[PDB]
Design an enzyme around this catalytic site. Structure first.
Site, PDB file in Angstrom:
ATOM      1  N   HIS B  51     -14.691  15.154  17.330  1.00 24.98           N
ATOM      2  CA  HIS B  51     -14.219  16.578  17.362  1.00 24.98           C
ATOM      3  C   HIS B  51     -13.782  16.963  15.944  1.00 24.98           C
ATOM      4  CE1 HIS B  51     -14.650  16.765  21.661  1.00 24.98           C
ATOM      5  NE2 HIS B  51     -14.219  15.509  21.682  1.00 24.98           N
ATOM      6  N   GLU B  58      -5.873  17.907  10.324  1.00 26.16           N
ATOM      7  CA  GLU B  58      -5.135  16.854   9.609  1.00 26.16           C
ATOM      8  C   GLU B  58      -5.264  17.083   8.117  1.00 26.16           C
ATOM      9  OE1 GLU B  58      -6.382  12.916   9.356  1.00 26.16           O
ATOM     10  OE2 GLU B  58      -4.427  12.007   9.691  1.00 26.16           O
ATOM     11  N   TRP B  80      -0.357  11.239  15.293  1.00 26.84           N
ATOM     12  CA  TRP B  80       0.839  10.950  14.493  1.00 26.84           C
ATOM     13  C   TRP B  80       2.108  10.896  15.292  1.00 26.84           C
ATOM     14  CZ3 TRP B  80       0.958   8.761  10.184  1.00 26.84           C
ATOM     15  CH2 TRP B  80      -0.140   8.797   9.322  1.00 26.84           C
ATOM     16  N   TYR B  94       1.167  10.826   2.899  1.00 25.55           N
ATOM     17  CA  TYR B  94       0.148  11.481   2.136  1.00 25.55           C
ATOM     18  C   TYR B  94       0.445  12.841   1.533  1.00 25.55           C
ATOM     19  CZ  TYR B  94      -2.264   7.999   4.919  1.00 25.55           C
ATOM     20  OH  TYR B  94      -2.685   6.870   5.591  1.00 25.55           O
ATOM     21  N   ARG B 127     -10.189   9.288 -15.501  1.00 33.13           N
ATOM     22  CA  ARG B 127      -8.892   9.213 -14.818  1.00 33.13           C
ATOM     23  C   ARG B 127      -8.578  10.324 -13.848  1.00 33.13           C
ATOM     24  NH1 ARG B 127      -6.137   9.054 -20.727  1.00 33.13           N
ATOM     25  NH2 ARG B 127      -7.848   7.600 -21.056  1.00 33.13           N
ATOM     26  N   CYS B 146      -2.923   4.218   4.486  1.00 34.43           N
ATOM     27  CA  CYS B 146      -4.119   3.412   4.752  1.00 34.43           C
ATOM     28  C   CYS B 146      -5.198   3.792   3.719  1.00 34.43           C
ATOM     29  CB  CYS B 146      -4.656   3.466   6.164  1.00 34.43           C
ATOM     30  SG  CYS B 146      -3.449   2.946   7.378  1.00 34.43           S
ATOM     31  N   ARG B 166      -6.927   0.501   2.033  1.00 34.09           N
ATOM     32  CA  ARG B 166      -6.355  -0.824   2.123  1.00 34.09           C
ATOM     33  C   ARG B 166      -6.527  -1.514   3.456  1.00 34.09           C
ATOM     34  NH1 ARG B 166      -2.035  -1.531   5.388  1.00 34.09           N
ATOM     35  NH2 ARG B 166      -1.022   0.526   5.904  1.00 34.09           N
ATOM     36  N   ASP B 169      -9.150   0.426  10.603  1.00 33.30           N
ATOM     37  CA  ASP B 169      -9.420   0.198  12.037  1.00 33.30           C
ATOM     38  C   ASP B 169     -10.832   0.743  12.136  1.00 33.30           C
ATOM     39  OD1 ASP B 169      -9.693   0.724  14.689  1.00 33.30           O
ATOM     40  OD2 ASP B 169      -7.619   1.443  14.947  1.00 33.30           O
ATOM     41  N   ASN B 177     -11.528   9.043   8.915  1.00 30.45           N
ATOM     42  CA  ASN B 177     -11.327   8.896   7.471  1.00 30.45           C
ATOM     43  C   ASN B 177     -12.645   9.175   6.711  1.00 30.45           C
ATOM     44  OD1 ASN B 177      -9.236   6.145   8.348  1.00 30.45           O
ATOM     45  ND2 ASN B 177      -8.548   8.233   8.133  1.00 30.45           N
TER      46      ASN B 177
HETATM   47  C1  F89 Z   1      -4.043   1.005  14.819  1.00 28.97           C
HETATM   48  C2  F89 Z   1      -4.236   2.373  14.256  1.00 28.97           C
HETATM   49  N1  F89 Z   1      -3.196   3.077  13.971  1.00 28.97           N
HETATM   50  C3  F89 Z   1      -3.231   4.430  13.458  1.00 28.97           C
HETATM   51  C4  F89 Z   1      -2.072   5.107  13.121  1.00 28.97           C
HETATM   52  C5  F89 Z   1      -2.103   6.408  12.650  1.00 28.97           C
HETATM   53  C6  F89 Z   1      -3.315   7.054  12.423  1.00 28.97           C
HETATM   54  C7  F89 Z   1      -3.348   8.346  11.899  1.00 28.97           C
HETATM   55  C8  F89 Z   1      -4.547   8.989  11.675  1.00 28.97           C
HETATM   56  C9  F89 Z   1      -5.757   8.324  11.908  1.00 28.97           C
HETATM   57  C10 F89 Z   1      -7.132   8.900  11.529  1.00 28.97           C
HETATM   58  N2  F89 Z   1      -7.232  10.368  11.422  1.00 28.97           N
HETATM   59  C11 F89 Z   1      -7.158  11.149  12.646  1.00 28.97           C
HETATM   60  C12 F89 Z   1      -7.271  12.541  12.764  1.00 28.97           C
HETATM   61  C13 F89 Z   1      -7.184  13.178  14.001  1.00 28.97           C
HETATM   62  C14 F89 Z   1      -7.003  12.363  15.137  1.00 28.97           C
HETATM   63  C15 F89 Z   1      -6.925  10.958  15.049  1.00 28.97           C
HETATM   64  C16 F89 Z   1      -6.983  10.351  13.805  1.00 28.97           C
HETATM   65  C17 F89 Z   1      -7.353  10.403  16.386  1.00 28.97           C
HETATM   66  N3  F89 Z   1      -7.191  11.622  17.267  1.00 28.97           N
HETATM   67  C18 F89 Z   1      -7.747  11.567  18.700  1.00 28.97           C
HETATM   68  C19 F89 Z   1      -6.568  12.098  19.617  1.00 28.97           C
HETATM   69  C20 F89 Z   1      -5.479  10.935  19.736  1.00 28.97           C
HETATM   70  C21 F89 Z   1      -4.108  11.588  19.952  1.00 28.97           C
HETATM   71  O1  F89 Z   1      -4.120  12.831  19.350  1.00 28.97           O
HETATM   72  O2  F89 Z   1      -3.206  11.085  20.629  1.00 28.97           O
HETATM   73  C22 F89 Z   1      -8.985  12.535  18.689  1.00 28.97           C
HETATM   74  O3  F89 Z   1     -10.124  11.798  18.470  1.00 28.97           O
HETATM   75  O4  F89 Z   1      -8.828  13.762  18.800  1.00 28.97           O
HETATM   76  C23 F89 Z   1      -6.924  12.730  16.586  1.00 28.97           C
HETATM   77  O5  F89 Z   1      -6.687  13.891  16.848  1.00 28.97           O
HETATM   78  C24 F89 Z   1      -5.756   7.033  12.459  1.00 28.97           C
HETATM   79  C25 F89 Z   1      -4.538   6.375  12.709  1.00 28.97           C
HETATM   80  C26 F89 Z   1      -4.504   5.049  13.230  1.00 28.97           C
HETATM   81  C27 F89 Z   1      -5.768   4.140  13.578  1.00 28.97           C
HETATM   82  O6  F89 Z   1      -6.911   4.542  13.432  1.00 28.97           O
HETATM   83  N4  F89 Z   1      -5.572   2.912  14.089  1.00 28.97           N
HETATM   84  O1  UMP Z   2      -8.553  -3.658 -19.553  1.00 25.78           O
HETATM   85  C1  UMP Z   2      -9.393  -2.814 -19.853  1.00 25.78           C
HETATM   86  C2  UMP Z   2      -8.994  -1.615 -20.579  1.00 25.78           C
HETATM   87  C3  UMP Z   2      -9.943  -0.685 -20.862  1.00 25.78           C
HETATM   88  N1  UMP Z   2     -11.239  -0.751 -20.552  1.00 25.78           N
HETATM   89  C4  UMP Z   2     -11.989   0.259 -20.964  1.00 25.78           C
HETATM   90  C5  UMP Z   2     -12.618   1.351 -19.982  1.00 25.78           C
HETATM   91  C6  UMP Z   2     -13.024   2.426 -21.007  1.00 25.78           C
HETATM   92  O2  UMP Z   2     -14.058   1.951 -21.829  1.00 25.78           O
HETATM   93  C7  UMP Z   2     -11.743   2.472 -21.869  1.00 25.78           C
HETATM   94  C8  UMP Z   2     -10.660   3.279 -21.402  1.00 25.78           C
HETATM   95  O3  UMP Z   2     -10.749   4.565 -21.550  1.00 25.78           O
HETATM   96  P1  UMP Z   2     -10.412   5.719 -20.573  1.00 25.78           P
HETATM   97  O4  UMP Z   2     -11.245   5.328 -19.345  1.00 25.78           O
HETATM   98  O5  UMP Z   2      -8.889   5.793 -20.367  1.00 25.78           O
HETATM   99  O6  UMP Z   2     -10.972   7.047 -21.158  1.00 25.78           O
HETATM  100  O7  UMP Z   2     -11.342   1.060 -22.038  1.00 25.78           O
HETATM  101  C9  UMP Z   2     -11.631  -1.926 -19.896  1.00 25.78           C
HETATM  102  O8  UMP Z   2     -12.691  -2.104 -19.552  1.00 25.78           O
HETATM  103  N2  UMP Z   2     -10.739  -2.875 -19.581  1.00 25.78           N
HETATM  104  O1  UMP Z   3      -6.027   6.922   8.604  1.00 23.40           O
HETATM  105  C1  UMP Z   3      -5.874   5.785   8.980  1.00 23.40           C
HETATM  106  C2  UMP Z   3      -4.582   5.229   9.317  1.00 23.40           C
HETATM  107  C3  UMP Z   3      -4.537   3.957   9.815  1.00 23.40           C
HETATM  108  N1  UMP Z   3      -5.561   3.121  10.034  1.00 23.40           N
HETATM  109  C4  UMP Z   3      -5.303   1.929  10.539  1.00 23.40           C
HETATM  110  C5  UMP Z   3      -5.553   0.560   9.766  1.00 23.40           C
HETATM  111  C6  UMP Z   3      -4.720  -0.442  10.588  1.00 23.40           C
HETATM  112  O2  UMP Z   3      -5.360  -0.896  11.753  1.00 23.40           O
HETATM  113  C7  UMP Z   3      -3.472   0.425  10.902  1.00 23.40           C
HETATM  114  C8  UMP Z   3      -2.341   0.326  10.044  1.00 23.40           C
HETATM  115  O3  UMP Z   3      -1.633  -0.806   9.996  1.00 23.40           O
HETATM  116  P1  UMP Z   3      -1.077  -1.636   8.772  1.00 23.40           P
HETATM  117  O4  UMP Z   3      -2.499  -1.945   8.013  1.00 23.40           O
HETATM  118  O5  UMP Z   3      -0.218  -0.629   8.000  1.00 23.40           O
HETATM  119  O6  UMP Z   3      -0.338  -2.845   9.216  1.00 23.40           O
HETATM  120  O7  UMP Z   3      -3.956   1.774  11.139  1.00 23.40           O
HETATM  121  C9  UMP Z   3      -6.815   3.656   9.688  1.00 23.40           C
HETATM  122  O8  UMP Z   3      -7.800   3.081   9.832  1.00 23.40           O
HETATM  123  N2  UMP Z   3      -6.909   4.912   9.212  1.00 23.40           N
END
Ligand code: F89
Ligand code: UMP
Ligand code: UMP
Ligand code: F89
Lengths: 264, 264
Positions: B51, B58, B80, B94, B127, B146, B166, B169, B177
């Site tokens: 959807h 979001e 959330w 965020y 940058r 995340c 990082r 899921d 995402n």
């Molecule tokens: C374990 C886990 N934890 C999370 C914690 C918070 C999150 C926040 C956002 C998102 C990803 N972005 C969105 C953006 C919108 C929606 C949802 C996620 C999922 N969601 C369901 C509805 C779920 C609900 O609203 O209760 C939908 O598909 O509409 C949303 O409305 C994922 C997580 C996760 C996640 O994906 N996994």
């Molecule tokens: O540890 C480092 C530091 C710099 N650079 C490089 C990337 C670019 O060539 C330049 C940095 O410039 P800017 O991306 O900030 O413009 O130095 C590396 O590869 N490794």
């Molecule tokens: O937008 C988001 C937010 C969260 N997660 C997921 C990753 C993990 O399963 C979890 C977060 O847990 P920690 O990695 O913070 O422990 O939610 C996503 O994939 N997307």
């Protein structure tokens, strides 16, 4: 190394010509990732002699949470001399952010100590991260972090690391950056009684400077050789206690070094 | 989509069983990268119904600098909810990091506006980054970021973006995402008079929860449909200016929805 030579070729074949900051010009690609199994030896390039000593002091400079190029001076690493003030200062770069990220509210956060602690008490954590990208202080740094953010991960008694590198000089910087991180995994791994896993490298703007073409081509024609092996001659009491003498490299038999101008 | 399906297969084929904070258990891999050329079509998954509305709201919320669920409520976004306090607050998540990152010297940096100025005046910069990873405020966040850090790149009059996630899921989170970031790219390119380039996703701990295995094999048994098309019906005077109504998705015919439980 195969992955390295392969990224170098890819820059040549597909890189886009960009005008950079230094007005030197680059061939550039955006978004690339390479994996190194640390089980297969140290990723030190063999296609150009590389010097482990430059690598090692820079890293230890970082762990100390230092931002003054003096320490680096007394060891002949001079890459950073063009960036320090007359005091020899770089601003709150890498080291400062790693050991003492300043909270908005007075405090400092020791990111290495946090990560050691997580590695020891919560290896499953999906939040084991170090960041040098302190938005609040980018203006004070001589140069914005290149090697910006890294994350550790444990799975089956092995310690893995992923680095996000926003900007990379493939010919000159890349080889150091790779070795430096490879080296941290190993040190972290030992202090945490873990075995080495993968070193994952992801880059942002990955480039070859327009005046490294000749050097590149030459490198491209050498045969990678078996990777050397790292030796840690003692288990320091802490990640902060390593010394240059503690590290050794076996089976390093590279192709002679290759000279190239840095773009500043 | 081919790419998402290949990632799922990959976690199944190479993932390791890992414990997690939610206590559910996961199958995980570490380090993955995938690219979506935005010119091929809008990357909304077709192998289960999505959807677009919830993803839109979001994003507008992030862009507003909002961290309270009220808005999300008014529009039927409840994901959330579990994380929010009694007042509907999530902490400086965020939105707050994007529009007002707090500096140690009493400044607030607006990263969205900074990135827009860079795109207009210095698109060759290495940058152009937005980071949600504020080390000093992590402890105030209801959940640590995340999707943590993203970088922009321009080449051949096209806008690209690389996201570093990082923790992922794969079954539930990822589809949201991917579409979220792809709409940001479209929005920025429209503001900057650029064309859309590639959206590159990179993951840290990329996982499938244990309780998603069946839904995951069912999904996998489906053939992806052709990607929908995004139509923006207006050109707002600013990026903070879009309305849900400005967007239209065309040619979306997804297979049926599949529900899976969220690990809390
Ligand atoms: C374990 C886990 N934890 C999370 C914690 C918070 C999150 C926040 C956002 C998102 C990803 N972005 C969105 C953006 C919108 C929606 C949802 C996620 C999922 N969601 C369901 C509805 C779920 C609900 O609203 O209760 C939908 O598909 O509409 C949303 O409305 C994922 C997580 C996760 C996640 O994906 N996994
Ligand atoms: O540890 C480092 C530091 C710099 N650079 C490089 C990337 C670019 O060539 C330049 C940095 O410039 P800017 O991306 O900030 O413009 O130095 C590396 O590869 N490794
Ligand atoms: O937008 C988001 C937010 C969260 N997660 C997921 C990753 C993990 O399963 C979890 C977060 O847990 P920690 O990695 O913070 O422990 O939610 C996503 O994939 N997307
Ligand atoms: C364009 C550009 N700019 C930079 C600016 C600062 C950097 C800081 C560190 C590193 C990568 N890490 C090291 C770490 C140690 C050395 C070098 C790089 C190169 N170098 C030479 C001397 C530096 C020089 O060439 O003058 C050496 O003694 O081995 C080093 O000792 C790269 C850059 C770049 C870089 O790679 N490229």
């Amino acid at each position: 190394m195969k992955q390295y030579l392969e990224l170098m070729q890819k820059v040549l074949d597909e890189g886009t010509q960009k005008n950079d900051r230094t007005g030197t010009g680059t061939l550039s690609i955006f978004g690339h990732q390479m994996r190194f199994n640390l089980q297969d030896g140290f990723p030190l390039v063999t296609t150009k002699r590389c010097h482990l000593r430059s690598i090692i002091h820079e890293l230890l400079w970082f762990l100390q949470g230092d931002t003054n190029i003096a320490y680096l001076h007394e060891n002949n690493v001079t890459i950073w001399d063009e960036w320090a003030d007359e005091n020899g200062d770089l601003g709150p770069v890498y080291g400062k952010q790693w050991r003492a990220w300043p909270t908005p509210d007075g405090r400092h956060i020791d990111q290495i100590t946090t990560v050691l602690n997580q590695l020891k008490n919560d290896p499953d954590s999906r939040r084991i991260i170090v960041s040098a990208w302190n938005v609040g202080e980018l203006d004070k740094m001589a140069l914005a972090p290149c090697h910006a953010f890294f994350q550790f991960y444990v799975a089956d008694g092995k310690l893995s690391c992923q680095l996000y590198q926003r900007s990379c000089d493939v010919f000159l910087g890349l080889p150091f950056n790779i070795a430096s991180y490879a080296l941290l995994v190993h040190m972290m791994a030992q202090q945490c009684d873990l075995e080495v896993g993968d070193f994952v490298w992801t880059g942002g703007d990955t480039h070859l400077y327009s005046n490294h073409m000749d050097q590149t081509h030459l490198q491209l024609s050498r045969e990678p050789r078996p990777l050397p092996k790292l030796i840690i001659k003692r288990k320091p009491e802490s990640i902060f206690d390593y010394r240059f003498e503690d590290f050794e490299i076996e089976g390093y038999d590279p192709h002679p070094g290759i000279k190239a101008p840095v773009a500043i």
